[PDB]
Amino acid sequence: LVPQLSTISRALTPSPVMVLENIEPEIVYAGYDSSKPDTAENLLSTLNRLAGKQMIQVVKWAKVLPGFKNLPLEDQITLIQYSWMSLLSFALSWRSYKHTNSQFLYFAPDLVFNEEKMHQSAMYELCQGMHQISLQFVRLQLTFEEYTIMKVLLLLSTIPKDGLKSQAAFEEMRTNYIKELRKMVTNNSGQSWQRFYQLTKLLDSMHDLVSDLLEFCFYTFRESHALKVEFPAMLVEIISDQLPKVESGNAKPLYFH
Amino acid sequence: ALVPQLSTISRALTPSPVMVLENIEPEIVYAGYDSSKPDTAENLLSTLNRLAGKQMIQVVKWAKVLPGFKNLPLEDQITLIQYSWMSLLSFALSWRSYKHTNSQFLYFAPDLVFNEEKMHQSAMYELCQGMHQISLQFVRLQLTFEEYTIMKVLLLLSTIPKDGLKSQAAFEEMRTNYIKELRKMVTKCNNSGQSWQRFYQLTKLLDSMHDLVSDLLEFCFYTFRESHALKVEFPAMLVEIISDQLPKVESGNAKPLYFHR
Numbered sequence: 105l106v107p108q109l110s111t112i113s114r115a116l117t118p119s120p121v122m123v124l125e126n127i128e129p130e131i132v133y134a135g136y137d138s139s140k141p142d143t144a145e146n147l148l149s150t151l152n153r154l155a156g157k158q159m160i161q162v163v164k165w166a167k168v169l170p171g172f173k174n175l176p177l178e179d180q181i182t183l184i185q186y187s188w189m190s191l192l193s194f195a196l197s198w199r200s201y202k203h204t205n206s207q208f209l210y211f212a213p214d215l216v217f218n219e220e221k222m223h224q225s226a227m228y229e230l231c232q233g234m235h236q237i238s239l240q241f242v243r244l245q246l247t248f249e250e251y252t253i254m255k256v257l258l259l260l261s262t263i264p265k266d267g268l269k270s271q272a273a274f275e276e277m278r279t280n281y282i283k284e285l286r287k288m289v290t291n292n293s294g295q296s297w298q299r300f301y302q303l304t305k306l307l308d309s310m311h312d313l314v315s316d317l318l319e320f321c322f323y324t325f326r327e328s329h330a331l332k333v334e335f336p337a338m339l340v341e342i343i344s345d346q347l348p349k350v351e352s353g354n355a356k357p358l359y360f361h
Numbered sequence: 362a363l364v365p366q367l368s369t370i371s372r373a374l375t376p377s378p379v380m381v382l383e384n385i386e387p388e389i390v391y392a393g394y395d396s397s398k399p400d401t402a403e404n405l406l407s408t409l410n411r412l413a414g415k416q417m418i419q420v421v422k423w424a425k426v427l428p429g430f431k432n433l434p435l436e437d438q439i440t441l442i443q444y445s446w447m448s449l450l451s452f453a454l455s456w457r458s459y460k461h462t463n464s465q466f467l468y469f470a471p472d473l474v475f476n477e478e479k480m481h482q483s484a485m486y487e488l489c490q491g492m493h494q495i496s497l498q499f500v501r502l503q504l505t506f507e508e509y510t511i512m513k514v515l516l517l518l519s520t521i522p523k524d525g526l527k528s529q530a531a532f533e534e535m536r537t538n539y540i541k542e543l544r545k546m547v548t549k550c551n552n553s554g555q556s557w558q559r560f561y562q563l564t565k566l567l568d569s570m571h572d573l574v575s576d577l578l579e580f581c582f583y584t585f586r587e588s589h590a591l592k593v594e595f596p597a598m599l600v601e602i603i604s605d606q607l608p609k610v611e612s613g614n615a616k617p618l619y620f621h622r
């Protein structure tokens with residue numbers, strides 16, 4: 105009989121962390137035009153357009169994300185829709201850390217926010233909250249490997265209150281990625297667990313931040329006409345789905361602590 | 362033919378570490394409390410110290426048969442028992458209090474249960490309240506016996522010399538193995554969120570024993586130093602342990618291990 109196990113294949117297959125490096129999207133440009141006045145209506149509309157371009161890259165990433173194809177298609181779609189703001193805000197803090205040593209908010213290479221832009225955006229305190237995560241990355245000296253695993257954990261951090269089509273398949277993927285993070289921080293058990301706790305505390309802290317970001321997002325979406333804030337098709341699709349679900353209490357956050 | 366050296370039957374019948382922890386748990390020890398004598402601090406503290414000595418005899422017997430502990434150098438076995446004794450005895454007190462009184466009292470022994478009045482009379486009221494707070498956490502968390510027995514071993518492995526043990530690697534192997542036992546123990550039939558939340562609560566509880574035990578040891582070293590003025594008596598077993606530990610702890614040689622920063 106032909107062995108159906110392949111030692112060679114299992115040995116040669118890149119680790120999940122190596123695959124995450126391989127599939128990480130290239131940096132996206134905002135197409136920022138310096139000729140427009142730096143008023144909230146213009147800055148926020150630019151950010152929303154940048155978000156639409158980023159989400160095109162998130163979907164491409166999710167398609168090749170190990171384990172994600174094992175979930176029901178409806179669940180894959182659901183998880184992308186519930187986690188979008190967590191994914192994009194965490195990646196903003198990563199780019200800010202890597203490209204500016206967390207001195208600025210690096211939304212795109214052509215759109216870097218200093219304090220002045222943060223004021224002009226009319227969401228200063230929200231920018232401060234995102235900046236505080238970037239500052240935590242410096243304090244923790246977060247690694248790229250840790251960051252990529254934590255991004256997947258954020259994709260798996262909010263589920264519908266009723267539940268997914270396959271709760272079991274979801275739990276299996278979530279447990280597998282938590283295991284990957286636990287391996288990354290490993291001998292000194294004391295030090296490994298202390299770091300693991302710092303990373304899961306940070307993950308949990310994204311829920312309160314994202315809640316505040318979505319509150320402002322839904323507000324500007326509802327008042328888009330009055331406020332002259334534009335949204336691209338991709339965000340209209342996502343927010344039209346999410347706004348009623350989140351505001352009705354259907355979004356259940358998953359915490360480590 | 363040749364006699365196979367491995368025993369399939371032995372391997373199958375060998376109990377899990379958790380089952381062994383149940384089998385080796387010490388029997389409850391009596392204090393020999395004498396209600397005919399006044400409940401003065403001298404009498405109550407001297408009774409508790411005598412109780413502690415009897416309890417430590419059981420602890421040593423338990424440590425001899427604790428899975429994995431034999432793999433550590435003898436020097437390290439003795440060191441860990443000496444560094445952790447107050448953690449072990451105080452955690453077990455909270456367990457007895459939880460199991461026998463629903464955490465209403467401090468169940469030092471079947472013949473010595475402290476209510477608030479004895480807590481005041483002992484001249485360590487605040488310390489008694491601190492141990493009682495751990496008992497109350499057991500109720501809030503609905504701690505199980507299995508979780509308790511694994512946590513007690515982690516306390517035995519929670520304080521090490523600043524300079525390190527003879528074999529840090531053998532120590533780390535045993536500590537990791539028992540942390541894995543606790544992790545499996547809190548794994549539900551699966552909900553990762555619930556499992557991690559409980560693991561967090563249990564490790565926060567473990568860590569909280571350090572500040573409590575530091576305060577307990579401060580009082581202990583104080584009454585030991587002033588034993589004659591205070592008329593507090595210590596049995597030979599505690600004189601041995603405290604004489605070793607007092608200079609080591611006060612000189613800053615005891616390194617507590619934490620799960621959380």
Ligand SMILES: C[C@]12C=CC(=O)C=C1CC[C@@H]1[C@@H]2C(=O)C[C@@]2(C)[C@H]1CC[C@]2(O)/C(O)=C/O
Pocket residue numbers: 148149151152153154155158189192193195196210211227230317320321322324325333
């Ligand atoms: C996704 C985004 C754009 C790209 C990025 O790297 C990080 C973020 C996170 C913060 C988002 C932002 C937006 O695009 C516009 C937002 C969504 C904002 C929070 C409030 C907001 O300013 C809003 O709702 C304007 O209408």
Ligand SMILES: C[C@]12C=CC(=O)C=C1CC[C@@H]1[C@@H]2C(=O)C[C@@]2(C)[C@H]1CC[C@]2(O)/C(O)=C/O
Pocket residue numbers: 406407409410411412413416447450451453454468469485488577580581582584585593
């Ligand atoms: C070990 C012990 C005795 C048996 C027990 O179930 C739990 C404890 C924990 C608290 C201990 C105690 C003692 O025996 C006496 C102590 C050690 C006390 C804390 C201060 C103390 O009261 C003291 O130093 C008197 O001299």
